[PDB]
Amino acid sequence: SGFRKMAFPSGKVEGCMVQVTCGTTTLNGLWLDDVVYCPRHVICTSEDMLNPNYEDLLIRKSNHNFLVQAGNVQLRVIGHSMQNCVLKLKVDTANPKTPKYKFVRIQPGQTFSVLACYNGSPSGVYQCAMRPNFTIKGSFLNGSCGSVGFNIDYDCVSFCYMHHMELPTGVHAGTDLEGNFYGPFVDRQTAQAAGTDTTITVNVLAWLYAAVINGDRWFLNRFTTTLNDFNLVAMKYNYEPLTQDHVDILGPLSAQTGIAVLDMCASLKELLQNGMNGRTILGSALLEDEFTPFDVVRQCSGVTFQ
Amino acid sequence: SGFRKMAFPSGKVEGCMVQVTCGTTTLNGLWLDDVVYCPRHVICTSEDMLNPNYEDLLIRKSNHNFLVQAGNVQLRVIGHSMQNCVLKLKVDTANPKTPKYKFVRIQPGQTFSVLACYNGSPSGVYQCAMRPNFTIKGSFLNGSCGSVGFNIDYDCVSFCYMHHMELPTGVHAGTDLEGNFYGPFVDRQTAQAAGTDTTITVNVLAWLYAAVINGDRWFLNRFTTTLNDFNLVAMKYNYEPLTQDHVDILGPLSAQTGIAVLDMCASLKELLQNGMNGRTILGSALLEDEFTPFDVVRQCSGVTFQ
């Protein structure tokens, strides 16, 4: 038993990370088949980023102004194009380590693993959630841009995130691999408002189920509630409203533990209104919202990938 | 910026995980060069584990009596030996994916990444600390034994942990790769007392430095203290005593932030006596002790591997 925030094994993604240099800027790119994907602000200096005209800056560049290096292998750039906020660099060679892969646009509240990289080399791997306001709370230093987020399904890598920027507030924003930002953000160094962030209610509930499965039960009370009654308490505490779709997704956890979903919502409502009174749940003194119901089931059955 | 509990990239280790079956028991093994390492209780039935005589049970087995599978290709077992609590199964072929590697015995309070595996296939990766009482708080289901813990230094994998068992209390115990248990535990299914666990003081201070580096500063108070006075408060809250060696290890973090170590100990001592009063540090409502000073420097400096 036990419950840990677990990232996916990063091997399949490590073999796809390359270094992209344009002028003085170096960042990470993703090499799949014969295309390298990277943030388009690789073509910007630190001064361009204040107000960049990406179409005009890209026109000043040719294929040989893009230095792409995979480990110690230099790749030959034979074409370049801009798709929304990503650059696609066509190279001479197909990546021999290309895994089975998909490009996916995930929804707020879904989670993914981030392979943080610098200069095309992997630094570490951790799990993240796309917040309801479409930011993430990562660990990204200078040079991390182009680091990617992903999920793995047996042998297929679903790429869902590419890192582009840190907002002045210290949170992180990026795109899917078609180059469309999550949220209202733009790849410009300016003040950018993230909306109010809220707690992913269905994720907290799944984590309470994981706690029950692991023997933590002190928070189980003798109340229940209704969906509408819970959502009144949800909006006071900046929690996302619970829908019937979320109740349905929690069905299997309900079935395994024998605790009805609206009964778990009554325990959650008393945790929100009374706090935790110095207690902990699964080693945490806060309510955790970074596990999806599918994450909880995965960790609890021990699914493998290879 | 930002600070996350980060695991090492697991690619080099994924290529070494194999499946070891002996009779009805299946667990994970580690294939390095022409040797497969796995827990010796793979040779036990579920009933043998109550009082196993490993020498007698191993004698009933021959080289062909061990099924080693790497992905879908089977290996040729040409020798077997027991070294303390691990089995060394000599196979015909050297693992072509063998990384540069060392076997190391770590100290309490040091950290490592765990590649959780089932049936020889990787399931997930997370960072763990060896507790002062020589347990770890992992996530390990049935079939997870033989999962390994490791650190990476550029290109060399330092293997430090092999998972062997879950104690009845739900915490986890295992060996180094010479088969010597960490702590007073044995590979027998019986009640086994872990000692009192204490908090890794030097790790908490490193994490407080990481918090300051990342902009969290409210806990900086304007008192100081001495080493003996801090250790008086440390022992009341089940913290491990701080030594001069620990002060020295924190030196570079001290130098970067301009905060002397004993001033950081005064902020910690008031955090222990007053709690956090509903505040958080790096998103946590508890004091974190799973980052070593070297972990903090690595993450804040962006060191990369391979």
Cβ of residue A167 closer than 8 Å to a chain B Cβ: no
Nearest CB partner across the interface for B304, out of A7, A119, A172 = A119
Provide the resolution (angstroms): 1.9
What 3-state DSSP class applies to B98? coil
**Backbone dihedral angles phi then psi of residue A101, each to the nearest 5 degrees:** -150, 155
**Partner B, chain A 14-43, Cβ-Cβ below 8 Å:** 14-15
Catalytic choice (A16, A22, A41, A172): A41
Interchain contact, B11 vs A14, CB within 8 Å: yes
Chain A hits for B157, Cβ within 8 Å: none
Cα A163–A167–A173 angle (5° rounding)?
Answer: 30
Query: How many C-alpha atoms does A24 have within 13 Å on its Cβ side?
Result: 5
β-pairing, B156-166 with B100-103?
Answer: parallel
Report the C-alpha gap between B57 and B65 in whole angstroms.
12
Contact B181, B117 (CB under 8 A): no
Report which of A288, A214, A26, A46 is spatially closest to residue B284, judged by C-alpha positions: A288
DSSP string, A177-246: TTSPBSSS--SSSS--------B-HHHHHHHHHHHHHTT--TT--S----HHHHHHHHHHTTBPPP-HHH
Active site residue A246: no
Domain residue limits, chain A: 1-14+100-197, 15-99, 198-301
What are the C-alpha distances in Å from A52 to residues A26, A57, A187, B127? 17, 8, 9, 40
User: A8 and A158 in contact (C-beta within 8 Å)?
Assistant: no
Q: Does residue A242 contact residue A230 with C-beta atoms inside 8 Å? A: yes
Check if A172 is active-site: no
Region of residue B218 (phi > 0: left; psi between -120 and 50: alpha; otherwise: beta): alpha
Q: How far apart are CA A213 and CA A256, in angstroms?
A: 9
- Contact (CB, 8 A) for A117 and B8: no
A262-to-A202, B218, B222, B297 alpha-carbon distances in Å: 12, 38, 48, 45
Q: Which residues pair with B161 in a beta bridge?
A: B149
List the end-to-end C-alpha distance of chain B, in Å, as a whole number: 23
Which tokens sit at B253? 């973090």
Superfamily of domain B198-301, CATH level 4 = main proteinase (3clpro) structure, domain 3 (1.10.1840.10)
Q: How far is CA A224 from the centre of its chain?
A: 33
User: How many C-beta atoms surround the C-beta of residue A278 within 10 A?
Assistant: 8
For the domain covering A1-14+100-197, report its CATH number. 2.40.10.10
The amino acid sitting at A84 is: N
CA A55/CA A42 separation, integer angstroms: 13
Q: Do A6 and B123 touch (CB under 8 A)?
A: yes
DSSP state of B301: H
Q: Are B120 and A284 a contacting pair at CB < 8 A?
A: no
* 3-class SS of residue A41: helix
* Widest CA span in chain A: 69
Asked if B289 and B207 touch (Cβ cutoff 8 Å), the reply is: yes
Q: Does A196 touch chain B (CB under 8 A)?
A: no
Chain B hits for A7, CB-CB cut-off 8 Å, are 7, 124-126
CATH number belonging to domain A15-99: 2.40.10.10
Q: Which residues of A touch B118 (CB under 8 A)?
A: 302, 304
The residues of B assigned a catalytic role are 41, 145
- Whether B1-14+100-197 and B15-99 share one fold: the answer is yes
The technique by which this structure was obtained is X-ray
Phi, psi of A148 (to 5 degrees): -120, 155
